[PDB]
Amino acid sequence: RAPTSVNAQEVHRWLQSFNWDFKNNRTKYATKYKMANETKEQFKLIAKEYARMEAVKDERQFGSLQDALTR
Amino acid sequence: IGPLWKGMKRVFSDGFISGDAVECSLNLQLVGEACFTNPLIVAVTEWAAANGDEITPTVFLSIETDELRHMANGYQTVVSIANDPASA
Amino acid sequence: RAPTSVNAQEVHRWLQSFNWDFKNNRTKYATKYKMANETKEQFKLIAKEYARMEAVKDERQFGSLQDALTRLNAGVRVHPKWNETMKVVSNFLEVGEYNAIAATGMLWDSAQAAEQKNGYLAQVLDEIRHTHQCAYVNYYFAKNGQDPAGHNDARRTRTIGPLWKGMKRVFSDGFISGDAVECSLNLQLVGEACFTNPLIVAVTEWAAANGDEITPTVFLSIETDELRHMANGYQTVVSIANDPASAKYLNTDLNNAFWTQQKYFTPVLGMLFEYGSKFKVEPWVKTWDRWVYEDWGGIWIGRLGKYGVESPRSLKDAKQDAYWAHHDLYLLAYALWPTGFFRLALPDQEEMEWFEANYPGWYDHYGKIYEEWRARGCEDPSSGFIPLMWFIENNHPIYIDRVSQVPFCPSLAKGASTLRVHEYNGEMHTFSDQWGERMWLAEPERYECQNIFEQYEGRELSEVIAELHGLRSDGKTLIAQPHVRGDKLWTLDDIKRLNCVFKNPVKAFN
Amino acid sequence: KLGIHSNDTRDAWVNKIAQLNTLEKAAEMLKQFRMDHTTPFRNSYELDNDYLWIEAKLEEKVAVLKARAFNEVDFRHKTAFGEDAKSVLDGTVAKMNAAKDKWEAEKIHIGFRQAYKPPIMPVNYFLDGERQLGTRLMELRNLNYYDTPLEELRKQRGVRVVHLQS
Amino acid sequence: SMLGERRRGLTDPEMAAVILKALPEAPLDGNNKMGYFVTPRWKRLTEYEALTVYAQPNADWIAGGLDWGDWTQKFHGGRPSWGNETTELRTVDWFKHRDPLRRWHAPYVKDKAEEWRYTDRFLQGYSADGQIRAMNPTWRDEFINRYWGAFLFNEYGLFNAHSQGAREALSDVTRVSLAFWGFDKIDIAQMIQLERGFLAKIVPGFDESTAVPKAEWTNGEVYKSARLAVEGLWQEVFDWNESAFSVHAVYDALFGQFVRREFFQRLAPRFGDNLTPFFINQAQTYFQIAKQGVQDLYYNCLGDDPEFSDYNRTVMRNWTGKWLEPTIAALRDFMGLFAKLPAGTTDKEEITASLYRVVDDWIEDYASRIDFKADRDQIVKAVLAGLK
Amino acid sequence: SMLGERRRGLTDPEMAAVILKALPEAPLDGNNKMGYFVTPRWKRLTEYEALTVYAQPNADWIAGGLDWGDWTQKFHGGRPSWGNETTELRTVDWFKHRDPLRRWHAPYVKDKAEEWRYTDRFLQGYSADGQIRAMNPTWRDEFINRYWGAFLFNEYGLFNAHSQGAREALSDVTRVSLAFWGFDKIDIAQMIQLERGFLAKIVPGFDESTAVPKAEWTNGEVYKSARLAVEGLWQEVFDWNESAFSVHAVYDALFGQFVRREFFQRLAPRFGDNLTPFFINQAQTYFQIAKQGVQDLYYNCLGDDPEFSDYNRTVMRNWTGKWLEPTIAALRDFMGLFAKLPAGTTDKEEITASLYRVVDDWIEDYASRIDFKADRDQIVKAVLAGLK
Numbered sequence A: 001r002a003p004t005s006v007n008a009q010e011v012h013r014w015l016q017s018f019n020w021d022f023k024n025n026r027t028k029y030a031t032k033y034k035m036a037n038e039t040k041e042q043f044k045l046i047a048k049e050y051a052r053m054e055a056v057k058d059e060r061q062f063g064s065l066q067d068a069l070t071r
Numbered sequence B: 001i002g003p004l005w006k007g008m009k010r011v012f013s014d015g016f017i018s019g020d021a022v023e024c025s026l027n028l029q030l031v032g033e034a035c036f037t038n039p040l041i042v043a044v045t046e047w048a049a050a051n052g053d054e055i056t057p058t059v060f061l062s063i064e065t066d067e068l069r070h071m072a073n074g075y076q077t078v079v080s081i082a083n084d085p086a087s088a
Numbered sequence C: 001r002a003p004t005s006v007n008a009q010e011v012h013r014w015l016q017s018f019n020w021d022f023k024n025n026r027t028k029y030a031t032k033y034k035m036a037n038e039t040k041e042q043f044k045l046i047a048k049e050y051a052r053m054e055a056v057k058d059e060r061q062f063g064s065l066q067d068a069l070t071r072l073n074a075g076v077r078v079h080p081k082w083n084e085t086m087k088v089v090s091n092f093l094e095v096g097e098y099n100a101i102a103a104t105g106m107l108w109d110s111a112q113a114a115e116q117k118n119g120y121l122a123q124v125l126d127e128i129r130h131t132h133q134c135a136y137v138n139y140y141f142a143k144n145g146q147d148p149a150g151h152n153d154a155r156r157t158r159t160i161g162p163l164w165k166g167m168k169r170v171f172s173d174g175f176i177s178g179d180a181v182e183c184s185l186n187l188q189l190v191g192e193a194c195f196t197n198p199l200i201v202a203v204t205e206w207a208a209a210n211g212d213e214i215t216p217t218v219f220l221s222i223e224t225d226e227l228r229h230m231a232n233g234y235q236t237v238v239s240i241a242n243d244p245a246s247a248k249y250l251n252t253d254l255n256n257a258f259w260t261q262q263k264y265f266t267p268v269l270g271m272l273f274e275y276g277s278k279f280k281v282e283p284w285v286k287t288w289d290r291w292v293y294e295d296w297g298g299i300w301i302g303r304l305g306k307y308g309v310e311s312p313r314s315l316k317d318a319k320q321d322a323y324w325a326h327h328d329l330y331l332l333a334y335a336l337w338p339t340g341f342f343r344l345a346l347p348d349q350e351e352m353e354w355f356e357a358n359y360p361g362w363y364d365h366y367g368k369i370y371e372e373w374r375a376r377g378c379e380d381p382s383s384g385f386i387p388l389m390w391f392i393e394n395n396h397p398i399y400i401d402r403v404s405q406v407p408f409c410p411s412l413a414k415g416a417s418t419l420r421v422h423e424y425n426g427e428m429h430t431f432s433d434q435w436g437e438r439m440w441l442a443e444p445e446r447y448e449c450q451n452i453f454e455q456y457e458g459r460e461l462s463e464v465i466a467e468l469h470g471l472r473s474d475g476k477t478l479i480a481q482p483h484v485r486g487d488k489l490w491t492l493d494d495i496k497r498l499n500c501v502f503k504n505p506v507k508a509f510n
Numbered sequence D: 001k002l003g004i005h006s007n008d009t010r011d012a013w014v015n016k017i018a019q020l021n022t023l024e025k026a027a028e029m030l031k032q033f034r035m036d037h038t039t040p041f042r043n044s045y046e047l048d049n050d051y052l053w054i055e056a057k058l059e060e061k062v063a064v065l066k067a068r069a070f071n072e073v074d075f076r077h078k079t080a081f082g083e084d085a086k087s088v089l090d091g092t093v094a095k096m097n098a099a100k101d102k103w104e105a106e107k108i109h110i111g112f113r114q115a116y117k118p119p120i121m122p123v124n125y126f127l128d129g130e131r132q133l134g135t136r137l138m139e140l141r142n143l144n145y146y147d148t149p150l151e152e153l154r155k156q157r158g159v160r161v162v163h164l165q166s
Numbered sequence E, F: 001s002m003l004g005e006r007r008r009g010l011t012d013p014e015m016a017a018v019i020l021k022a023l024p025e026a027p028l029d030g031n032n033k034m035g036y037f038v039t040p041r042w043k044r045l046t047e048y049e050a051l052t053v054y055a056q057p058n059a060d061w062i063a064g065g066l067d068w069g070d071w072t073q074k075f076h077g078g079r080p081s082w083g084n085e086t087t088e089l090r091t092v093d094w095f096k097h098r099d100p101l102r103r104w105h106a107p108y109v110k111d112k113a114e115e116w117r118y119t120d121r122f123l124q125g126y127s128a129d130g131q132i133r134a135m136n137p138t139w140r141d142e143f144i145n146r147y148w149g150a151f152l153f154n155e156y157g158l159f160n161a162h163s164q165g166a167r168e169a170l171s172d173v174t175r176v177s178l179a180f181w182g183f184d185k186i187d188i189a190q191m192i193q194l195e196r197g198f199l200a201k202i203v204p205g206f207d208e209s210t211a212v213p214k215a216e217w218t219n220g221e222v223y224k225s226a227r228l229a230v231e232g233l234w235q236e237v238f239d240w241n242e243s244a245f246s247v248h249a250v251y252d253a254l255f256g257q258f259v260r261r262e263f264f265q266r267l268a269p270r271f272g273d274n275l276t277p278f279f280i281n282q283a284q285t286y287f288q289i290a291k292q293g294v295q296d297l298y299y300n301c302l303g304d305d306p307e308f309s310d311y312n313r314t315v316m317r318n319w320t321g322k323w324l325e326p327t328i329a330a331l332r333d334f335m336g337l338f339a340k341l342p343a344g345t346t347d348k349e350e351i352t353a354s355l356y357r358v359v360d361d362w363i364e365d366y367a368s369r370i371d372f373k374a375d376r377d378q379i380v381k382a383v384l385a386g387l388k
């Protein structure tokens, strides 16, 4: 019964399998190129961890602005 | 009212969304962001500090922290089409 | 299905009913008072909402410190003298904040009304917050400032010096040792309402004036919590006002609390302000009169007049002794500079003018002495001179008040000079005033604090400093210094060569 | 070897304490120590700079021995000397409530601490006593606290006035 | 004015120039780490440790203190501001404890504030989604309003049991942990009332008054022995460690865990109640957070003390035996609540299995740590006698 | 160096002196309120509006625009960067929309960040408290891993349906709301996976791979019509408003609200599962959040447009009927899932009560708004016919 959890990476691990193939599963915009459907992204983020890392930046920023800088 | 605004819209509005998605990607991430915005944001904070502005550095430096990821998207856009014969 | 929720006041409405009756539902602490079972509180908070409002303040505070202030190099661009003052101001206040935690835990135990208990509880949490905030100032200045020594280890290096002992009297033991009501007076009715609330603000002023924007950021945040604590102290008097014992003991406990706090802060605060700064904000004398007399001693205390509360009977003597007290004390702190955890400086020419201007007769007494010490080479390591030596050569013994722990030199002081020496059951005791003397005579067992001369008797100065880690990271240079310049810092060897051996000044009496 | 935190005096007592191997011996030594070195009524001030620390080391030994000697019930309810803690508490409180003045009162409270401070008496009973005894002591002491002049108070306390300056 | 009258030394040209002129070429010491002398529990000194350890000005005569000499002002009679006499436990250093969650004030209120806002969002989405429709009326008006309601007084009493420790704890790290353990208890009691108040808003006729839950607690049978135990832990215990240890390592670990997890959390869902489980999730997270701290203080630091390990275990075993009886009695009276449920809700086997889960977790997380010889079937059999 | 080499105009004596000397005695305009020309939706202008309204550089030829002229660069062919041609709906002003929660980026990530951290503490408490013990082995290994997991692809599909709107939205306020509706959807999909990953850590044999749950979604019978409906709303709709309206005010309001609430949430507890409900609470809090926005845009703004009220309602009534059928079909195929539930779990009476709750709510929140007279009985019966 040791405290346990799951991080963004452990979830993003299966993100690529989220999309499934079918009929009109294609871009709606004119283009001359074809982007590989197996392309990967460098940062393994999920909506919740993304929010957290940005909220932390916001804290500092708005904190400096509303407090010290205004003083 | 002014003429300088028109050109801004051309590079940072219409140049970002009107045309082949890949061309828009190049205008935005490959050139705009990688070549201009990334360095620009930092330069602005430098000129700002020299002129007494500590507000802009506080905000713009935080914006800067996010650019690394956008650089990747642009870089990944070219990698995504590098195999399609249309690329060359 | 209209989106709805519940707020703090909606839950607090029933908080008073949380407590129930049972035989042993009573305070575990000794007291002469009975707090009313139906006493209520001023603010309707619950744990969750308390946390939220404090968390909001923390974000602005830490955001300012970690971001803009750091980019501005605010930890460095402060006057050397003020960097030293904050080592003392922040660490000493830290202990007051810390003891206030235990103090309010004890008041919470005393209160029988759920609402009054809750008011105290919110303070217990606030005092933990304040301890951690004061700690952060030292932590920040140690990390980013011009001299980390003292900022980085005050919790152990403060034990070397005499100024620390008195601090524990008013802001440590005075807050938790005695009748819960007596403690509430020392902490809230007098401690905060009279000195802390105005002091915290005053500190941010002197700080800003000397280039310090770190302290204003943290202390202004601390200040936002004081209102609630003021109400706790006020509600303390209300809860015990309708009790027969109140009319019999309240004023006595208040007068003692008042003298206790004033005896230490009157000279120490004024000293840190005027002598621990470059740019002056206001003369301590006028700052004091406004705080102690006008604001507190008249307006704030007058309101509680309908509860039997009267103006302290020692108030008049406190005033007569205030004017010169801080000036008298700096002479001693500087003379004993090797026992500190901070760097001190002689008043500069511009400062002496300011002092003479605001305190006529300052030059003829203190000014000349400082000029003499400079000539003797008090700032230079190779001089082999420490101001203490001057007190010896001129037969000016320095005593320690057995009750307040405040050092005093009766033969030299311009303010009070009434030394009282008693012998009781094989021990000698030295007092500086008639109020503390009564305290000891009436309650001998409450005041047995050994002073630095008693503990250090027969010890060579450098040995005490070395044993108590009063050295910088090089293991040779002293933390304390007699000047605030960057070069020619005294080493332990410079002190050892002085071959200064402590002696208990009271042993001369037969 | 003379120091603040470590010195020959403290070393000598550590050795003395290491030789107290039975509860009764150790408990008696602790009580004797408190009579000789604590409170303003101590028999002497010779160990003023080290008694607080020495007393705690002595307490440590008495505690460890008591826990090994007493069964669970006695550890909770009896003093190191085998007295019923509740009886001692009620008895001392009774005397306190019968005290005629603040002078008799301070003797009772101070004496109680010297003789029964943990690990002699279980902490629950001792602090319950602190609560009750301290209340009465304060009530007697704070009544007309300023009426007696210093000249006369010095005489009541029984101090020897060595030097007076005005 | 736009610029104001107060000149600041950081930005004022003249003042800043004076300040910069007096500055040294470089820092007067390269050791820029506050608390560098503190022995780190983990790889490197933490912000938690630096800001907390040694804040308490103890002298060396209180194990681990760095100061010297007596206190400046003591209680009438002579009792010290803080002293060894306030607890039976002994140690080589009262400053060894470390909250495994490293909670100092800032992180503590940050997390609780997040939970407060999450809670507000939850209730708004719960009421807007009309989930109250699927909740069984009897369970809502009887078991949640009266019995879950009465339990608030249990948590409130445990909160108060911490008041003396707040005043007497012998070190900063222990004071802060104890304070947070206690504050989380009052929070839970207030969340129980918060739920009742929320129900009074979205359910016509639901009375949020505490009169009923309070009458149940003060005069009912189901919580009679629980109340007697709580009254004791709170007001008959003067030893700050006996209090904290007995509350968390005996009473709340057995009685509290049973009520919150094996009764309300286990049965609430069966009556269409997804509301109470939300608040119980919080209480359980708080319980598990406190457990880490309690284990570190009593087992890691005291029960395993290199000098007083044997002594401290003897004392804690004593306390466990002392408080296990009143705790069993509390669980025994609580068994009476099962007869109030609608037939078919649960049965003797489920109740027994749930009791064994609580007893087994207790033996593992607490009893075994001090070699207390607990007999699980004997404990369960004593409790089951309360089933009507 | 201690001072650094870079001089700052705010603190450098020389530079600051020059700056101070150039400042005016007072502000050159007393109107220090940014966005003062924006029409407040409430009493006073909010930070949300000031920072968002009119950020989009539309010219006056796009209802509401403040700029003039054509775009500077268009698509090959002449298609404008943004134009009235990307959606059937018309309005007097595309900037009228106002998110009732007034969410701009800052408040949005703050709330979600708190939930992320709350979630982490929850799982750490859940595990340490061993609450998994009361979890029915069948339910978790078959209904969560396969059917709950497969639903993630449903949310993931609705998420992607927002991509075109992210590009075509005709105003800032609508673009921000849209982006948040879709972002919350991907969050839900990722939370389904997270729960499965959590189970894998506390349940020895549990496999977190999406292999199983994916095969089901792709080649299954329960969600067959679901997937087909999703693929349509996403890759067959080229109108950003039809996509947002149909997805939120039709398909997810019916099928989604039933699958999430009336099935997994309504039954998870019955099998000793408080884990899945924890996350569904989020999906539902998120659903209720997006709903307030969807209502303000399509009803309060477009539906009640001073000039296109009738026209728009006609377009939405049309869209409703268009997707109401594919949705009802998605539900039918979902009915066949109950047959896989252990006999006795639920009867056709409940299944009917829940169905009506969803349909009724849908009518009170959406249908009645655009006057799309729908028959509750006919719908329920049409779906109920799926019960295999």
Ligand SMILES: [Ca+2]
Pocket: C509, C510
């Ligand atoms: Ca003599």
Ligand SMILES: [Ca+2]
Pocket: E221, E224, E333
């Ligand atoms: Ca009974």
Ligand SMILES: [Ca+2]
Pocket: E347, E349, E350
């Ligand atoms: Ca059965």
Ligand SMILES: [Fe+3]
Pocket: B033, B067, B070
């Ligand atoms: Fe970018």
Ligand SMILES: [Fe+3]
Pocket: C097, C100, C126, C127, C130
């Ligand atoms: Fe404070």
Ligand SMILES: [Fe+3]
Pocket: C100, C192, C226, C229
């Ligand atoms: Fe305060």
